[PDB]
Amino acid sequence: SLFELGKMILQETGKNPAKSYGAYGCNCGVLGRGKPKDATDRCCYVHKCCYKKLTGCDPKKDRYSYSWKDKTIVCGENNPCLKELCECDKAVAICLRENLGTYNKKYRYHLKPFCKKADPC
Amino acid sequence: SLFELGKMILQETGKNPAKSYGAYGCNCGVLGRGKPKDATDRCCYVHKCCYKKLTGCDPKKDRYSYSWKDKTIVCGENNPCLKELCECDKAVAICLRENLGTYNKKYRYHLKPFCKKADPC
Ligand SMILES: [Li+]
Numbered sequence A, B: 001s002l003f004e005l006g007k008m009i010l011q012e013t014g015k016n017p018a019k020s021y022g023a024y025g026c027n028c029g030v031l032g033r034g035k036p037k038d039a040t041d042r043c044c045y046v047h048k049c050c051y052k053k054l055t056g057c058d059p060k061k062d063r064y065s066y067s068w069k070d071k072t073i074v075c076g077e078n079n080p081c082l083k084e085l086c087e088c089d090k091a092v093a094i095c096l097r098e099n100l101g102t103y104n105k106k107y108r109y110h111l112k113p114f115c116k117k118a119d120p121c
Helices: A002-013 A017-021 A039-052 A080-098 B002-013 B017-021 B039-051 B080-098
Strands: B066-068 B073-075
Touching: A002 A017, A002 A080, A039 A080, B002 B017, B002 B066, B002 B073, B002 B080, B039 B080, B066 B080, B073 B080
Parallel strands: none
Antiparallel strands: B066 B073
16 A cells, blocks of 8 residues: 555655655656656656556555565565565665665656656556 | 646645645645644545545546636536536645644655554545
């Protein structure tokens, strides 16, 4: 769910997930996908595609378990859809952290700017 | 769309929407709902619950017409969804203005992963 996602983002990146990734480039946020603007944006693209692959479980609503043991995210067994959901979110948290070096606040928006069409997932 | 909403917030509250409310508390902005921190946040909770009742239009993307007449938001859509959407937005802008008295600037970029579970709408 958004809950786990937001938390994982904060645990990995150390950044306020809404503030840093709630409206960033073409893919981080709640405005679907678009041609990634940079590596961080690109994490969000893969994440949104990760979500498309899920079957049945609700990526926004459905809670799942993960542990943060040794400051690494391990997705709990869950059921397959929830485990995969979790893996999607873990992936994007990790990728965002990984790409903090090129994170660029100029891609943050209030209203979403220009985004060419993303490739189909 | 976020454009009309933000315009309304500005008109009602006289504050930059993105800054003041774009990430406020547990409900204003991107992390879905959490338990409202305060009255401002609870406006945003109600707003999100309002958006849930909308059939067949998109709050994030869909433009709609409204007028600001004698400093009053007046929704002007023929389209039943866009009219209802407009009303959700008007309602939050008015609410935000109404609770400017308790606006807690420390919630402005509240860390949403701290939020407790929201009650259902
Ligand atoms: Li009114």
